[PDB]
Amino acid sequence: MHHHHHHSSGLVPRGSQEIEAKEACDWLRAAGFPQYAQLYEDSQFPINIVAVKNDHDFLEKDLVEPLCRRLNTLNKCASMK
């Protein structure tokens, strides 16, 4: 394994954040946790995410990961700048 071995990944958030936002909240309900989204409308989205994914979200680990994506996504768009 030569030193020329790695896996980089760019980042393009600022853009689809719009469609991602509406989905993020509309996804939490489809994922099985409509309790979270309910916060979006309240704007209480930005908060200790990590402590949240643990707080309630405990069903399926594959459902915990994406949960950090939407929350982390809206948590930014929920700032209304």
Side-chain angles (χ1 to χ4, degrees):
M1 317 101 133
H2 245 263
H3 36 20
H4 280 78
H5 232 269
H6 18 225
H7 61 338
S8 300
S9 47
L11 250 170
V12 60
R14 178 156 150 293
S16 32
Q17 214 83 358
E18 306 296 279
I19 280 56
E20 248 291 290
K22 300 231 69 235
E23 268 285 1
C25 127
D26 205 87
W27 179 85
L28 285 153
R29 336 200 94 159
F33 324 111
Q35 168 267 285
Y36 279 115
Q38 274 276 283
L39 303 178
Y40 171 63
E41 306 102 70
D42 309 9
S43 212
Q44 305 213 116
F45 244 59
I47 44 148
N48 48 24
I49 291 169
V50 177
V52 127
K53 323 209 301 100
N54 295 238
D55 182 294
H56 150 40
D57 223 51
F58 244 80
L59 191 106
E60 269 177 80
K61 194 90 204 75
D62 125 86
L63 258 165
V64 160
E65 259 284 87
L67 190 104
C68 85
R69 251 70 57 85
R70 312 316 195 196
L71 293 174
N72 180 56
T73 303
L74 266 173
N75 282 22
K76 240 66 114 301
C77 201
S79 308
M80 301 132 69
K81 266 170 257 52

